[PDB]
Amino acid sequence: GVVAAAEKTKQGGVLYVGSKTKEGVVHGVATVAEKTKEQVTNVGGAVVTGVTAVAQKTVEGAGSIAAATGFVK
Amino acid sequence: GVVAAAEKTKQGGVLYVGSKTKEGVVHGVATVAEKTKEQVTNVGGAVVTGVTAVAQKTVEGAGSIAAATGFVK
Amino acid sequence: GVVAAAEKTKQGGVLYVGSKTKEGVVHGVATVAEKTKEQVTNVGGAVVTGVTAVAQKTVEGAGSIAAATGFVK
Amino acid sequence: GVVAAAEKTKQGGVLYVGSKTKEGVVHGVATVAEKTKEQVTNVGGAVVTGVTAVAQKTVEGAGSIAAATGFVK
Amino acid sequence: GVVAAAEKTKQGGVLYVGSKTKEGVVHGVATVAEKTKEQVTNVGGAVVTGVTAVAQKTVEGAGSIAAATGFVK
Amino acid sequence: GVVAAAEKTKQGGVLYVGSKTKEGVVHGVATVAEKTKEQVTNVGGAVVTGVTAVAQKTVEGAGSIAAATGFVK
Amino acid sequence: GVVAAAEKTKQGGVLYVGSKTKEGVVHGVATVAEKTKEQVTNVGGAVVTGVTAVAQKTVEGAGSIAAATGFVK
Amino acid sequence: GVVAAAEKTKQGGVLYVGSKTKEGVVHGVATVAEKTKEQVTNVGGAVVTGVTAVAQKTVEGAGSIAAATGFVK
Amino acid sequence: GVVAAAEKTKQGGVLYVGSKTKEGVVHGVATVAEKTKEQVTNVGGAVVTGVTAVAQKTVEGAGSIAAATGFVK
Amino acid sequence: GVVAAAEKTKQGGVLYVGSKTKEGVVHGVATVAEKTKEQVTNVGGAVVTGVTAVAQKTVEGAGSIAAATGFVK
């Protein structure tokens, strides 16, 4: 049983990033593989993958990830 | 049983990014594979993949991911 | 049983991104594969894949993903 | 049983993006594959894939994805 | 049983994007494949695929996707 | 005395140019000027001003140019 | 006395250029000037100003240029 | 006395250039000037100003240039 | 007395250049000047100003240049 | 007396250049000046100003340059 449950219940600055760049090569979440069986990638949050990657107030509630892999049995 | 459940119940700054870039090569969530069986990619949140990637107040409620892979049995 | 359930119940700044770029090559969620069986990609949230990728207040409720892959049985 | 259920019940800033770009090559959700059996792509949210990709207040309720793939049985 | 159910019940800023671009090549949700059996693409949300892709207040209720693929049995 | 005199008295291979181009902007003999008095341009030979400019066996006899300019006296 | 005299008296391979180009901006003989009095340009030979500029056996006899400029006296 | 005299009296391989280029900006004989009096440009030979500039057997006889400039007297 | 005289009297291999370039900015004979009086440019030979500039057997006879400049007297 | 005289009287291998370059900025004969009086440039030979500048058998006879500048007297 692969169960994920998420609940969010609500009973209700200055940020400068000045970037100047030449030749930016950026990889983020990279799974490189030869001779494989499973390649599972769950993003329950935030993958912010710039050359200028700004993430403000980003992942702010009830993330639930249930990964079950393999299980030859 | 692969169950995902999400509930969101509601009983109800300055951000400068100045980027100047030449030759930006950006990869984000990359699964590169030879001789595989499963390539599963779940995005229950945010994949923000710029050269200028800004993500403000982004993933703010009730993300649920239930991944079940393989299971030869 | 592959079940996904989502419920959202409601009983009810300044962001500058100045980008100047030359030669932007951007990949986002990329699954590259030879000799495969399954390539599953679920986006229950947001894949924002610019050269200037801005995502404000984006993924704000009740995302549910139920992925079941393989199951040779 | 591949079940997806979504319910949304309702009992009821300044964003500048100035982009100047030359030679933008953008891929988003890309599944490239040789010798495959299934290529499933579900978008229950938002795939915003510009060279200038802005996504404001975008994925704000009751996304449900139920993917079941393979099942040789 | 491949069931999708969606219910939406209702008992009831400034965004500048100035883009100046030359040579924009944009792909969005791309499934490229040789020697395949199934290519399923469900869009229960929004695929906004400009060179200037703006998506405001977009995916705001009751998305349900039930994908079942393969099932050799 | 501005004298030009020319006399020509006669008592009597493989050239491949493969050009493939995009966006060619070509200027040749350009005299750009503000607040001037004389703009003299004599061509006693050859001004070959292509994007693909080939000149074979071109200027082969008795060119004479006599330019006298100004002379406030 | 501005005298030019030219006399030509006659008592009588493989060249591959493979060019592949994008975005060629070419200037040749350029005289750019503000607040000037004389702009004299004599071409007694060859100005070959391509993006692919080939000049074979070109300037092969009796070029004479007599330029006299200014002379306030 | 500004005298030019030219006399040409006649009593009578493999060259590969493979160029592959992107973004070529080429200037040749450029005279850039503010607040000037004389801008004299004599070409008694060859100005070959390509992005691929080939000049074979080019300036092969009797070039004569007589430039006299200024002479306030 | 500004005298130029040229006389040419006639009583009668493999060259590979493989160039592969990106972003070539080329200046040749450049005279840049503010607050000037004379800008004299005589080319009695060869100005070959490519990104791929090949000059074979080029300046092979009787070049004569007589430049006289200034002479306040 | 500014005299130039040239006389040419005639009583009658393998060269590989493999160049692979990125970001070539090339200046050749450059005279940069503020608050000047004379800018004289005589080319009685060869100015070969590539990013790949090849000059074979080039300046092979009777070059004569007579430059006289200033002469306040």
UniProtKB/Swiss-Prot annotation, chains A, B, C, D, E, F, G, H, I, J:
<dbReference type="GO" id="GO:0030672">
    <property type="term" value="C:synaptic vesicle membrane"/>
</dbReference>
<dbReference type="GO" id="GO:0035493">
    <property type="term" value="P:SNARE complex assembly"/>
</dbReference>
<comment type="function">
    <text>Neuronal protein that plays several roles in synaptic activity such as regulation of synaptic vesicle trafficking and subsequent neurotransmitter release. Participates as a monomer in synaptic vesicle exocytosis by enhancing vesicle priming, fusion and dilation of exocytotic fusion pores. Mechanistically, acts by increasing local Ca(2+) release from microdomains which is essential for the enhancement of ATP-induced exocytosis.</text>
</comment>
<dbReference type="GO" id="GO:0030544">
    <property type="term" value="F:Hsp70 protein binding"/>
</dbReference>
<dbReference type="GO" id="GO:0005886">
    <property type="term" value="C:plasma membrane"/>
</dbReference>
<keyword id="KW-0472">Membrane</keyword>
<dbReference type="GO" id="GO:0098794">
    <property type="term" value="C:postsynapse"/>
</dbReference>
<dbReference type="GO" id="GO:0005743">
    <property type="term" value="C:mitochondrial inner membrane"/>
</dbReference>
<dbReference type="GO" id="GO:0008198">
    <property type="term" value="F:ferrous iron binding"/>
</dbReference>
<dbReference type="GO" id="GO:0060090">
    <property type="term" value="F:molecular adaptor activity"/>
</dbReference>
<dbReference type="GO" id="GO:0045963">
    <property type="term" value="P:negative regulation of dopamine metabolic process"/>
</dbReference>
<dbReference type="GO" id="GO:0000976">
    <property type="term" value="F:transcription cis-regulatory region binding"/>
</dbReference>
<dbReference type="GO" id="GO:0006638">
    <property type="term" value="P:neutral lipid metabolic process"/>
</dbReference>
<dbReference type="GO" id="GO:0009410">
    <property type="term" value="P:response to xenobiotic stimulus"/>
</dbReference>
<dbReference type="GO" id="GO:0051402">
    <property type="term" value="P:neuron apoptotic process"/>
</dbReference>
<dbReference type="GO" id="GO:0016234">
    <property type="term" value="C:inclusion body"/>
</dbReference>
<keyword id="KW-0832">Ubl conjugation</keyword>
<keyword id="KW-0225">Disease variant</keyword>
<keyword id="KW-0963">Cytoplasm</keyword>
<dbReference type="GO" id="GO:0043524">
    <property type="term" value="P:negative regulation of neuron apoptotic process"/>
</dbReference>
<dbReference type="GO" id="GO:0005576">
    <property type="term" value="C:extracellular region"/>
</dbReference>
<dbReference type="GO" id="GO:0051262">
    <property type="term" value="P:protein tetramerization"/>
</dbReference>
<keyword id="KW-0907">Parkinson disease</keyword>
<dbReference type="GO" id="GO:0099512">
    <property type="term" value="C:supramolecular fiber"/>
</dbReference>
<dbReference type="GO" id="GO:0048489">
    <property type="term" value="P:synaptic vesicle transport"/>
</dbReference>
<feature type="modified residue" description="Phosphoserine">
    <location>
        <position position="64"/>
    </location>
</feature>
<dbReference type="GO" id="GO:0030426">
    <property type="term" value="C:growth cone"/>
</dbReference>
<dbReference type="GO" id="GO:0001774">
    <property type="term" value="P:microglial cell activation"/>
</dbReference>
<dbReference type="GO" id="GO:0006631">
    <property type="term" value="P:fatty acid metabolic process"/>
</dbReference>
<dbReference type="GO" id="GO:0031115">
    <property type="term" value="P:negative regulation of microtubule polymerization"/>
</dbReference>
<dbReference type="GO" id="GO:1902957">
    <property type="term" value="P:negative regulation of mitochondrial electron transport, NADH to ubiquinone"/>
</dbReference>
<keyword id="KW-0908">Parkinsonism</keyword>
<dbReference type="GO" id="GO:0050808">
    <property type="term" value="P:synapse organization"/>
</dbReference>
<dbReference type="GO" id="GO:0010642">
    <property type="term" value="P:negative regulation of platelet-derived growth factor receptor signaling pathway"/>
</dbReference>
<dbReference type="GO" id="GO:0070495">
    <property type="term" value="P:negative regulation of thrombin-activated receptor signaling pathway"/>
</dbReference>
<dbReference type="GO" id="GO:0048169">
    <property type="term" value="P:regulation of long-term neuronal synaptic plasticity"/>
</dbReference>
<dbReference type="GO" id="GO:0051583">
    <property type="term" value="P:dopamine uptake involved in synaptic transmission"/>
</dbReference>
<dbReference type="GO" id="GO:1904715">
    <property type="term" value="P:negative regulation of chaperone-mediated autophagy"/>
</dbReference>
<dbReference type="GO" id="GO:0016491">
    <property type="term" value="F:oxidoreductase activity"/>
</dbReference>
<dbReference type="GO" id="GO:0005741">
    <property type="term" value="C:mitochondrial outer membrane"/>
</dbReference>
<dbReference type="GO" id="GO:0071872">
    <property type="term" value="P:cellular response to epinephrine stimulus"/>
</dbReference>
<dbReference type="GO" id="GO:1904307">
    <property type="term" value="P:response to desipramine"/>
</dbReference>
